[PDB]
Design a protein around this ligand. Structure first.
Ligand SMILES: NC(=O)c1ccc[n+]([C@@H]2O[C@H](COP(=O)([O-])OP(=O)(O)OC[C@H]3O[C@@H](n4cnc5c(N)ncnc54)[C@H](O)[C@@H]3O)[C@@H](O)[C@H]2O)c1
Ligand SMILES: NC(=O)c1ccc[n+]([C@@H]2O[C@H](COP(=O)([O-])OP(=O)(O)OC[C@H]3O[C@@H](n4cnc5c(N)ncnc54)[C@H](O)[C@@H]3O)[C@@H](O)[C@H]2O)c1
Ligand SMILES: NC(=O)c1ccc[n+]([C@@H]2O[C@H](COP(=O)([O-])OP(=O)(O)OC[C@H]3O[C@@H](n4cnc5c(N)ncnc54)[C@H](O)[C@@H]3O)[C@@H](O)[C@H]2O)c1
Ligand SMILES: NC(=O)c1ccc[n+]([C@@H]2O[C@H](COP(=O)([O-])OP(=O)(O)OC[C@H]3O[C@@H](n4cnc5c(N)ncnc54)[C@H](O)[C@@H]3O)[C@@H](O)[C@H]2O)c1
Ligand SMILES: Cc1cc(N)n(Cc2ccccc2)n1
Ligand SMILES: Cc1cc(N)n(Cc2ccccc2)n1
Ligand SMILES: Cc1cc(N)n(Cc2ccccc2)n1
Ligand SMILES: Cc1cc(N)n(Cc2ccccc2)n1
Lengths: 267, 250, 250, 267
């Protein structure tokens, strides 16, 4: 398998539609031994991770919690065993309150909400790198999840702002990670219709919000020379696994686009 | 004059070395009538702005203060007279605590420091556009100050992260500004006054026409070019006033 | 005037709809004294340029003709008078045979067609800079015309490829221009007049301040802004005069 | 192996220092069945390809020759056998006469030399795609070799111009390739000291040219958070193999940087 013998920490599983759920699934299919981290609802997360091909210890991690971060390395060390290290780290954590993305006007998002969004979505990529680099093997790899923020797009609002910050954090994390022989990269994925986005499409935020996501999806599939299936996270999961492998050994501080080539085309 | 009869708001003057002092000075030289804003040290700022070629009312604005933002348009309206609107807005506001910018390791900047820095340097660009667009004329222009964050670099650290967020906020501000027939753009300047020195000195070497980090005038003139009617099809964009250093690898 | 007393060379006029005709017109309105260049149909071009606000000598220049290039500086020198130099040069020259641009499949453009297109649209930018830099004043400015080629699109095909090569040539021209204290920049314009129509109409929708493909004036004004002294720290760069369409995804 | 059962055409082998030689070597190590193409000196090329882990049919291909292009698909079909198709295409062909890159001033390169350089380096990426797409399987992959031309750099001159054109050609090739379910991408590599560059370092083009390449190499290794070894093409070869695999299935019309992360850093 592509990741045979590799010890990989994977964060961000909340539902079986989570991009992380599919990263974990494909990583296990490729012979990786995983350590999973979950936020808040750990009983629910355990029930979700029970749906994976194989068993994996599950650790609690709230990236806004300093105690969880200060203890993370020792907790990982305990789960994988003394004398062992992590070969890979997957950051698949993203959040922005409704006030910062959706139908709320861009100017009406309060800074508390935007700052919480940027803490979890951008700053936490450096926090996790800081906590895990000392327990990472040389040749190691850290992958974060990006959504192309190069051009402004309706609805995404402050989440697009958080992704621009994340892109910058990634290049600085690469400088630190390099000292440990570790690579740091982001995967910029096309839109994925998780349980949450399926509710917006249905109308949880009103008919205007639904139509906004319906138009994005259509446009993305049209633009992509190989097409784009919003319901399938496998292509994105495989790209993350490719960055976790030894098959992109000279790529760091960079962004790999798993978007069907949509960002390279105007129409 | 290039900005003849234009009413322009200029924020960010702290010393006569501030880029905003040079923007203010060049704008006044080009016939603009100014409204200035100052943070925290308003008596100190008034003595600095006395050194400007012409008189300009000075208003207080702490970008982290919601009361200052809610009252900003009304206060500028009093200062420029009822039935008068702004043609230009200059955002020359930036800050990052020392833990997130300089010799401090990147990983050791607490989030409260990074957030305060992002609030002032990036969020406030949208805050000032929200407050002032309702008192802006069509053909109007909003200009922000940027330091190229496309590549990582020593020392600038979390300020580079805030500039990446600012470039994103600018694209969204342009979307809102458009409805008012107003442009929103950033000026990416070269640095203005061992790892830091080599990083800084690399700008002159790299720049095909050179770079003088002691001369803020080329950057001030670029801001005024965006504030004029001479770039009317440019919005949500970045204009590099860096000697062309960003276009050369060596 | 913005270009008061400046001596500027303007190439690329063919009809009164040519972007170069509008650059010429705006430059003359801003006090510039022009020298024009024309290709192949010099009698036709003279009648078009009579419609300009002021008189300007017209010279022949086939960018594919080495003799025209070798004699260009000497001929401009006669036209502007001995001991006088150019302050500005406008390259508004482009061409791609129909096999490489439009309805023809991308793969069916023979290399001779693509090469002729690249020679005229990209190589000639370096050719004109080589010929004219020796007769340019410091503080001088060279401006080229670009159509954003960062993303592929229907129809433009091999012209998009030539624009990608032009953006690269511009960065190298800036390196040489620098020695003469001269700037080199491109203006990336939005399109000026079923797959093509949707591609074109998408500019207005995308542009936060809008886009009028019938009005070449915003692009002409942007060229003049680069030709002025108001963007003196910008070189080897691209200025987008496209309504800000390139900064918006939808 | 990563490319087990895959039929891949690899062009651009001239010496055992060629980036293509190492692409081929790593591809064979990963279970790929290769078809090689070579320009002009085919006896010499056969002697070089004899140094590879396994045997591979060798076809003649001069990308400036229309007859070689019109016959390429049928010649490949003959070598791999009736009923079989190509899964991958590697374009590793680049040329620019000395007048267009090195010590010659940028303005002194004649258009004939620049046009020849752009024909072989940029146009030929579309010519090969046009000739090989009809004999390519769905899920197929075409990879070309790029050298980051985003910023002007001394010495590279018109070769940097040719690479900017190639980057644009790649996005248009992706539009065509997509119709056949095929991906098209470029690998932007850091500098590799092939036999030719080793001669420039030694002084074949004068002392000024050598110092120019000596400064580039040093700067690239310093800038890269994981470092850069100009004498090693393996990291670049592995990245090309990663694009030839099914592990980057949603990436097309794009550029993957195998440069040690140098382009993401200023100093
Ligand atoms: N869904 C898309 O269309 C899309 C597209 C591109 C990128 N992404 C990115 O992919 C990543 C995964 O998101 P997803 O789309 O799978 O949605 P998701 O809701 O399934 O996953 C995001 C995760 O963030 C976690 N999280 C939130 N706050 C946290 C905290 N304080 N501490 C720790 N974890 C916390 C949640 O528990 C959840 O597991 C995110 O970075 C997201 O921004 C999503
Ligand atoms: N000097 C450089 O090297 C350089 C280069 C590129 C961009 N810039 C940018 O130019 C702008 C001005 O920088 P400068 O070099 O003139 O420095 P400066 O110190 O003169 O200006 C920064 C200004 O921000 C103001 N400010 C801080 N906190 C504030 C708050 N809460 N509310 C309102 N105003 C607040 C300060 O009072 C000060 O006037 C900033 O956006 C900066 O990031 C500077
Ligand atoms: N119109 C648009 O949609 C648009 C958009 C962006 C950029 N541009 C660019 O603007 C420039 C002018 O385009 P335009 O729209 O005004 O079209 P145009 O037809 O008016 O101008 C092109 C000019 O190139 C000249 N030319 C052709 N071959 C030549 C040669 N061998 N030697 C010298 N001159 C030669 C022609 O005589 C003509 O005047 C070109 O570089 C074009 O690519 C056009
Ligand atoms: N060497 C570097 O530092 C470096 C860096 C980045 C990218 N590249 C690119 O990698 C690719 C391979 O180059 P390399 O560095 O291995 O050098 P190389 O000399 O070993 O390979 C280039 C190949 O181009 C072939 N070629 C030239 N003209 C041809 C024609 N008419 N028809 C067919 N083939 C022709 C040559 O025969 C040779 O095999 C090129 O695209 C090059 O531009 C090289
Ligand atoms: C870019 C993007 C799209 C989606 N769904 N996410 C994750 C997320 C989770 C919670 C709130 C907001 C966003 N990120
Ligand atoms: C990019 C840049 C350079 C400088 N001096 N600034 C402003 C600033 C003000 C206070 C603290 C930190 C930074 N921004
Ligand atoms: C980008 C663009 C659009 C137009 N009209 N041009 C000039 C041109 C002239 C002749 C043939 C083809 C193109 N360039
Ligand atoms: C970018 C780059 C570096 C090297 N050596 N090449 C290949 C090449 C082959 C012949 C002549 C010129 C260049 N491409």
């Amino acid at each position: 398998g592509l990741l045979d013998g590799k010890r990989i920490l994977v964060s961000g599983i909340i539902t079986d539609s989570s991009i992380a759920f599919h990263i974990a699934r494909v990583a296990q299919e490729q012979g990786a031994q995983l350590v999973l981290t979950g936020f808040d609802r750990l009983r629910l997360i355990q029930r979700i991770t029970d749906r994976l091909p194989a068993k994996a210890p599950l650790l609690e991690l709230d990236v806004q919690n300093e105690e969880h971060l200060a203890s993370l390395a020792g907790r990982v060390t305990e789960a994988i065993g003394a004398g062992n290290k992590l070969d890979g780290v997957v950051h698949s954590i993203g959040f922005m309150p409704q006030t910062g993305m959706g139908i709320n006007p861009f100017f009406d998002a309060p800074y508390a909400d935007v700052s919480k969004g940027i803490h979890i979505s951008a700053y936490s990529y450096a926090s996790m790198a800081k906590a895990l680099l000392p327990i990472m093997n040389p040749g190691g790899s850290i992958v974060g999840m990006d959504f192309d923020p190069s051009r402004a797009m309706p609805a995404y609002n402050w989440m697009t702002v958080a992704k621009s910050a994340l892109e910058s954090v990634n290049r600085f994390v690469a400088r630190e990670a390099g000292k440990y022989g570790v690579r740091s990269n982001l995967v910029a994925a096309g839109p994925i219709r998780t349980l949450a986005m399926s509710a917006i499409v249905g109308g949880a935020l009103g008919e205007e919000a639904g139509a906004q996501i319906q138009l994005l999806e259509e446009g993305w599939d049209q633009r992509a020379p190989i097409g784009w299936n919003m319901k399938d996270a496998t292509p994105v999961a495989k790209t993350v696994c490719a960055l976790l492998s030894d098959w992109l050994p000279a790529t760091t501080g960079d962004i790999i686009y798993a978007d069907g080539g949509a960002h390279t085309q105007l129409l």
